[PDB]
Scaffold this active site. Structure first.
Site, PDB file in Angstrom:
ATOM      1  N   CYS A 180      -7.066   0.485  -1.870  1.00 13.11           N
ATOM      2  CA  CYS A 180      -5.580   1.022  -2.442  1.00 13.11           C
ATOM      3  C   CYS A 180      -6.228   1.361  -3.983  1.00 13.11           C
ATOM      4  O   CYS A 180      -5.890   2.571  -4.313  1.00 13.11           O
ATOM      5  CB  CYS A 180      -4.695   0.145  -2.618  1.00 13.11           C
ATOM      6  SG  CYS A 180      -4.831  -1.511  -3.987  1.00 13.11           S
TER       7      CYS A 180
ATOM      8  N   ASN B  34       2.391   5.578  -1.017  1.00 10.83           N
ATOM      9  CA  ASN B  34       2.041   4.034  -0.724  1.00 10.83           C
ATOM     10  C   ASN B  34       0.004   4.951   0.062  1.00 10.83           C
ATOM     11  O   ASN B  34       0.241   6.256   0.135  1.00 10.83           O
ATOM     12  CB  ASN B  34       2.291   3.480  -0.002  1.00 10.83           C
ATOM     13  CG  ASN B  34       2.116   1.671   0.274  1.00 10.83           C
ATOM     14  OD1 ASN B  34       1.105   1.661  -0.350  1.00 10.83           O
ATOM     15  ND2 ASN B  34       3.437   1.465   0.574  1.00 10.83           N
TER      16      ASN B  34
END
Lengths: 309, 314
Positions: A119, A276
């Site tokens: 991420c 996201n």
């Protein structure tokens, strides 16, 4: 327990729809039981929502057969760290009540990491792409795999921070493009190739800790900003639409790296437009609106930063 | 059977939120069990929706503790004649010329009045009629007034009042009566009463009615586009309809021949690739999308949407 005979046809549909496969029938049953437990959470949550309890609703997604912990384990990757970087913005310049870089052509398609704590890579790449366009006028897909395989200060799929990603690109004097270094999802030996360089970085700036006002100005004046949040809740795991806000969100339990691409109001609720890394099949077509100005929800303004290029 | 102890706090919240009261504890339990059965239908429907099975989603509303049948019983009111008319009367709109707008929404043009609520009285026919009339009142006089449905309920003798009726008769009445009161001059009480049409409060008149070709959506589109809001009859006997929340409504179980509700078509358009009719309901704004529902357009005459269309000529 036992699976609910009713949902049989549904479980099969869900599995098909998401290319879900299970090694052992035992393995499958165990998963089926998790999916069903979640479905209940989702259904009852939405009930409270209609009763005016939540400013958002949930939906069954590809993470259906996973518990929150598994998600945080296999799908996050933020590793909290331990002068010339600050950017306490002044008041005068600009303070648009709303900003949405998706419309200005500064944002790239919602991508999907999955089964790799990269991420941090995606958040970094997210901010860089915003600057690449702001500077050169071109919108390119930069390479997160490049960051995964080369940022030695980070543990690759084991996790890392965005800063290190920025610093690397700088010291490396470049970062490849997605095409020049496709995301494979697994850790590999660094293969940064100069030929495919597509952007550079000349430093980074950090937004004052826990200062949403400063973060707003930052997003408004600099563009998309890398931010860290607490994505350990089931409500987040199944967000479908609305302004996300959960009192259980721990400001000190930062574990995910997302991209703030704007902000605004929706039905009287101020919010940050977040991007996201779990594909567009999650949240509102890949995005989620998170409560803005609500006591620094989920630590949204705790680890903000953007590349200087 | 038997209330799951989990939803206890919720049932109480729902009751509070909707001013729901019950005489007996027995009566209450029985209702609680219906509410719970519905909640399941809703929750599983939405699951299929996310799986790409439905072009719409459901939500818990004020009709939560009622079965579809009860809703159709106490909250509709459209009553087909079995033998319509005492001859004809040039009643049949004959299309138009030129190309038609891809989208129309009379709500924006100031032709539509606030979503109203009948409830516990089969006066949907009244509301649909009043709906079309109001559209014409504005189109003609330029003023948007709330006409009186109670007037229609209490005076259209060919209709059974809260027992149900058709829109045509409502139109004809206004014509033969040479007028219809305004909501203010004859407030909707929800119950049947002796006719009290008062001339002083007249607010609109009607000079006939026109019927749209049976089952012709194309004709209905032109009608809505050129004439304005049109009264239509649909099959509202399904639970999916009873709890519609947002999206393009489309249910394969909707029986084209089981017309039992009267709504108002106030426009049409496309949404996420789905053509649809913008419908206005009579169950208050606390149902559907703020009182409205988008129904599948051009999808083989869904729910008989183009089976009993008509609009007043004024």
């Amino acid at each position: 327990l036992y699976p609910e005979e009713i949902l049989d046809t549904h479980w099969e549909l869900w599995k098909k729809t998401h290319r879900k496969q299970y090694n052992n029938k035992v393995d499958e049953i165990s998963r089926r039981l998790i999916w069903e437990k979640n479905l209940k959470y989702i259904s009852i949550h939405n009930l409270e929502a209609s009763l005016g309890v939540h400013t958002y609703e949930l939906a069954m997604n590809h993470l259906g057969d996973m518990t929150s912990e598994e998600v945080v384990q296999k799908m996050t990757g933020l590793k909290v760290p331990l002068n010339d970087t600050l950017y306490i913005p002044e008041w005068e310049g600009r303070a648009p009540d709303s900003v949405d870089y998706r419309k200005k052509g500064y944002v790239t398609p919602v991508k999907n990491q999955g089964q790799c704590g990269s991420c941090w890579a995606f958040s970094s790449v997210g901010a860089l792409e915003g600057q690449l366009k702001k500077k050169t006028g071109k919108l390119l897909n930069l390479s997160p795999q490049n960051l995964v395989d080369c940022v030695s200060e980070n543990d690759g799929c084991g996790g890392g921070y965005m800063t290190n990603a920025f610093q690397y690109v700088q010291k490396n004097r470049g970062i490849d493009s997605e095409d020049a270094y496709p995301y494979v999802g697994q850790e590999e030996s660094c293969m940064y190739n100069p030929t495919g360089k597509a952007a550079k970085c000349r430093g980074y700036r950090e937004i004052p800790e826990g200062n949403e006002k400063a973060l707003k100005r930052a997003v408004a004046r600099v563009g998309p900003v890398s931010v860290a949040i607490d994505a350990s809740l089931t409500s987040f795991q199944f967000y479908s639409k609305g302004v996300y806000y959960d009192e259980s969100c721990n400001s000190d339990n930062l574990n995910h790296a997302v991209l703030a691409v704007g902000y605004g109001i929706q039905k009287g609720n101020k919010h940050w437009i977040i991007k996201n890394s779990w594909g567009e099949n999650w949240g509102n077509k890949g995005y989620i609106l998170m409560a803005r100005n609500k006591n620094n929800a989920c630590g949204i303004a705790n680890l903000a930063s953007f590349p200087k290029m």
